[PDB]
Amino acid sequence: ADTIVAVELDTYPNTDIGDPSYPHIGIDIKSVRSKKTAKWNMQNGKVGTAHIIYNSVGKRLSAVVSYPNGDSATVSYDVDLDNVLPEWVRVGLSASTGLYKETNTILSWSFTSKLKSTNALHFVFNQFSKDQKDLILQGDATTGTDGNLELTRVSSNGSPQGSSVGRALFYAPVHIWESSAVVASFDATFTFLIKSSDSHPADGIAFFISNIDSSIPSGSTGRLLGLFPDAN
Amino acid sequence: ADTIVAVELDTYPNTDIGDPSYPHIGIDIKSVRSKKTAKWNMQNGKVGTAHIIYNSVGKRLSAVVSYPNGDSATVSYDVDLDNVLPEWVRVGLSASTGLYKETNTILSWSFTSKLKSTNALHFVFNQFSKDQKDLILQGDATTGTDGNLELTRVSSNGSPQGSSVGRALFYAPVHIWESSAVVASFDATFTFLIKSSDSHPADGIAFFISNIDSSIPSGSTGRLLGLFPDAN
Amino acid sequence: ADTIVAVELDTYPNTDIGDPSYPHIGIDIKSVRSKKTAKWNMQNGKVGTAHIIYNSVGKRLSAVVSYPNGDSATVSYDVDLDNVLPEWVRVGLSASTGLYKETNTILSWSFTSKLKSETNALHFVFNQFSKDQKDLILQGDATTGTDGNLELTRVSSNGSPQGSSVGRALFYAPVHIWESSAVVASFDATFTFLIKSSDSHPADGIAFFISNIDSSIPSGSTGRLLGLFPDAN
Amino acid sequence: ADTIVAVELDTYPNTDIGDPSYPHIGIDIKSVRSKKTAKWNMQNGKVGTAHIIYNSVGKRLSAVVSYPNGDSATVSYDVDLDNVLPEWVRVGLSASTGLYKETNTILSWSFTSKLKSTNALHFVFNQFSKDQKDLILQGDATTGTDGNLELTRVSSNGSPQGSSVGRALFYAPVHIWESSAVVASFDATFTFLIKSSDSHPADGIAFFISNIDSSIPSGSTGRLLGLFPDAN
Ligand SMILES: Nc1ncnc2c1ncn2[C@H]1C[C@H](O)[C@@H](COP(=O)(O)OC[C@H]2O[C@@H](n3cnc4c(N)ncnc43)C[C@@H]2O)O1
Numbered sequence: 001a002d003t004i005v006a007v008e009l010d011t012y013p014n015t016d017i018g019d020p021s022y023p024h025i026g027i028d029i030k031s032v033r034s035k036k037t038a039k040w041n042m043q044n045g046k047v048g049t050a051h052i053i054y055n056s057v058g059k060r061l062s063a064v065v066s067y068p069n070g071d072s073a074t075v076s077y078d079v080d081l082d083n084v085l086p087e088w089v090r091v092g093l094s095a096s097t098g099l100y101k102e103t104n105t106i107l108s109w110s111f112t113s114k115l116k117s118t119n120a121l122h123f124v125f126n127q128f129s130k131d132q133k134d135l136i137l138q139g140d141a142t143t144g145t146d147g148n149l150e151l152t153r154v155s156s157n158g159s160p161q162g163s164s165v166g167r168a169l170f171y172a173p174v175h176i177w178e179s180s181a182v183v184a185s186f187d188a189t190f191t192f193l194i195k196s197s198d199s200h201p202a203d204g205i206a207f208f209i210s211n212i213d214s215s216i217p218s219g220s221t222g223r224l225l226g227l228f229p230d231a232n
Numbered sequence: 233a234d235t236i237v238a239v240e241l242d243t244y245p246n247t248d249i250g251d252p253s254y255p256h257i258g259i260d261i262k263s264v265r266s267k268k269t270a271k272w273n274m275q276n277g278k279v280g281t282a283h284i285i286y287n288s289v290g291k292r293l294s295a296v297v298s299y300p301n302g303d304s305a306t307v308s309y310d311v312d313l314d315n316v317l318p319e320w321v322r323v324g325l326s327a328s329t330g331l332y333k334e335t336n337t338i339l340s341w342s343f344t345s346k347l348k349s350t351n352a353l354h355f356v357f358n359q360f361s362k363d364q365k366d367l368i369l370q371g372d373a374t375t376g377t378d379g380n381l382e383l384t385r386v387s388s389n390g391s392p393q394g395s396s397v398g399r400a401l402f403y404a405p406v407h408i409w410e411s412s413a414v415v416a417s418f419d420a421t422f423t424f425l426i427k428s429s430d431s432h433p434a435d436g437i438a439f440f441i442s443n444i445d446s447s448i449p450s451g452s453t454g455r456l457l458g459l460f461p462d463a464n
Numbered sequence: 465a466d467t468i469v470a471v472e473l474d475t476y477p478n479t480d481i482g483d484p485s486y487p488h489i490g491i492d493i494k495s496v497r498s499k500k501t502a503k504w505n506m507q508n509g510k511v512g513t514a515h516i517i518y519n520s521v522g523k524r525l526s527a528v529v530s531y532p533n534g535d536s537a538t539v540s541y542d543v544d545l546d547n548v549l550p551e552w553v554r555v556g557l558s559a560s561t562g563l564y565k566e567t568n569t570i571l572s573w574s575f576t577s578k579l580k581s582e583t584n585a586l587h588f589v590f591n592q593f594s595k596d597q598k599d600l601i602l603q604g605d606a607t608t609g610t611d612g613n614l615e616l617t618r619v620s621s622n623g624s625p626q627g628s629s630v631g632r633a634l635f636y637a638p639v640h641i642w643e644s645s646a647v648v649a650s651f652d653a654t655f656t657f658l659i660k661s662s663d664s665h666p667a668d669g670i671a672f673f674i675s676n677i678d679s680s681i682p683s684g685s686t687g688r689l690l691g692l693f694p695d696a697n
Numbered sequence: 698a699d700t701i702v703a704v705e706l707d708t709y710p711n712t713d714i715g716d717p718s719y720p721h722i723g724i725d726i727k728s729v730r731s732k733k734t735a736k737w738n739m740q741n742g743k744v745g746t747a748h749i750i751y752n753s754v755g756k757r758l759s760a761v762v763s764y765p766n767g768d769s770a771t772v773s774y775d776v777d778l779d780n781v782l783p784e785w786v787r788v789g790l791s792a793s794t795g796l797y798k799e800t801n802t803i804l805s806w807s808f809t810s811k812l813k814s815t816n817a818l819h820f821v822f823n824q825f826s827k828d829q830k831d832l833i834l835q836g837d838a839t840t841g842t843d844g845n846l847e848l849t850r851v852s853s854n855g856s857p858q859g860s861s862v863g864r865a866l867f868y869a870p871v872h873i874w875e876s877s878a879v880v881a882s883f884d885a886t887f888t889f890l891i892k893s894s895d896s897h898p899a900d901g902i903a904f905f906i907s908n909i910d911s912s913i914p915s916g917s918t919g920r921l922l923g924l925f926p927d928a929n
Contacts, residue, residue: 281647283521283580283647283648285519285521285522285648285650287517287519287522287526289515289517289526289527289528289538289540290517290522290524290525290526290540292522292524294519294521294522295521296521296647296648298647304647306521308521308522348515348654414513414515414528414530414534414536415515415517415528417517421580
């Protein structure tokens, strides 16, 4: 399918594939099986902010999820991404549901990347339009009017759908490393609103990186976050 | 063809269509006929820089072209681009030759846009990659090997070609003005080498703004700068 | 005294000295007499936002002040600041009160300057202020901190703001504002603010200013002179 | 003296104090003995760039020193700067000479810091003017006319003096870290020309962080890089 590097906000403990007994945050290289997890304290109904950072000098792809109360989840992964992604990729946001469900409402999304050899990209979405000409949208992802990006299906009465999946990706393919680059570095941030009413909500939100032509790998609702075509 | 708002570095004095009887810089709205021109003193074989600035509050469209020596040309035009551009555009560069020719070699290209309602796009190319996936090149425009975007066709021994039109469009649509935003604005910078040993070289370089789906009007080589299909 | 170049949010109609008969916004070159005014429609007790844009190529200095409900205000002014201000200045925020009063609560302050000669550039942004802010020269009744806010005019424990107050806040470093090398010498500056009162009118307002590195509140610049000018000249 | 954290471009193999026996770059914490080092092939008279990076999330400090023909050098140190620097600091540059001598010529210097709760500071010198009011100069450091900050004393004929200490500190302080800070991260950049025909040259260039009131320690000339009061 694609080649994927992603940041998982697993709200549901899918443990026969392999997720610890609780909600967590993970680093995925080419698999739904996180190379690294951290316990996360999903705070329902509140707006949280996520930051992801990587430089190719320190080689440690990192992630932070927090809330205004202050609760913070953190994970690291030493890696030369250099070895997993192509010279050209796209950047996007992913979120799914299944049996259990939640809203997946992104209120803003800002990303930056440089190749200090410079070449650099810096886009930042603080409010989303009804028709957003610079976002490829796949799956149940749809925007506007309340100004927000809605990654997963939400009906009229503020009710999240079971078995939904959606993705939004910036229009322009992002050069992310080169042979020329002395420093291949990126950062990316998003402010989300997960709120449900189940036992535990499901399934999560992910920031992702992959090949320019990445679509949804069919049958990736629920526990696969609309990212992988199997749980291998 | 398409809608245009552009900035000409008009080198060849095509006066049976309204150019002044000399090399000039000028602001064109919807026409190869500049609403304001200024005496440019071209400096052949040298590396110059153009800045274009527009802020939607004071509504003044501005342009500067300078050489390292210290010589500068300037041209203003007050206007609510509000009435000439659509909500969504594309941005790029254009150069052309006809009977007399020149090199049209962009060394760097950068652009920023914001909607302080904030939304913002900011790209900067200090080198041009061989297969540069985030550029929509059209006509004889091609990157590569020297590090540079060759807008008009050049032969192997460095000898430029006549009757050659070239264009380079940054990949993404660019929200340029919003109903919603309090301040809509942009800036655009580029470095060039124009070299020839003709009587006057021809025809000149342009930064342009036009509707997302924009293509070179046929027969727009030379004096029309790969921007307009009539001389109206 | 100093050099001032500022933008006033002139809430009180000081007219025996030449504002007009309403809350306005003005470009002030070296005079509390604004070279250009535009009607502003004060929306008491809401957070508004100002942008102040200047490029050296266009030579037009602009101002916008708006509220959430989208109510706008615009004024511009053609000028070469090349030739008023010197090569080096300080930049800041000023407010005042008098026989009438208001909160002068700045919530965020941001400023960016460039000399496109590969550039010399300065970008700072204040989304929180702190109980100490080692990078903000604080003059007069000014105080950061505690609620998170820069407090330019005296407020008390009871939310009740004090009449006849004056304050200034300035970034700690000088700013190369224009050079003889610079093809473009350009700034922009943004702030968000909360002005609340109850008096017949409130007074007196908020201003963004540029002046010499050594600038300091002129004596008796409380009230209609915004902690900006030693005379009504 | 005060408190230091720095990145050393150690050009002289000082070994009765620790330096590995060759030109290197090192991360120094509160001691001239680098807690980390890496071999660097000093390229005489050529212009090189150093990038430094740290994010409080992944807690890894990074340095690259490279010349334009591709040759790099890398060294990394995991550390919680919570612990070593204070809420408030000054950012500055240092170099020195001793028994042996070199040109300590900085051709550009830029730094950025943020507190992503955003509070941010972003400054950059691409040309150093003669009288510069935003720099604190210390020791033998001087600027202007040629366009470059001269960290150690060079006389008229361009002959670099032996036994010279110099420092340049950016005027305003920097909030490096706070308690509210969910992320607090920085990066620096500088371009430099070290030229000499000594035996081995000396002593090297360093980027530093330290407290607002910091100044050159007495007899910190030569092998101490104008940073440390003793060789401990
Ligand atoms: N809406 C925003 N949100 C969050 N950060 C923002 C935003 N808007 C600007 N920033 C900033 C923060 C970073 O400094 C920079 C990221 O890199 P770029 O790839 O654009 O390179 C550096 C930028 O910083 C500028 N700056 C101006 N002059 C010099 C300079 N000489 N060196 C470095 N940076 C400079 C120009 C470049 O656009 O963009």
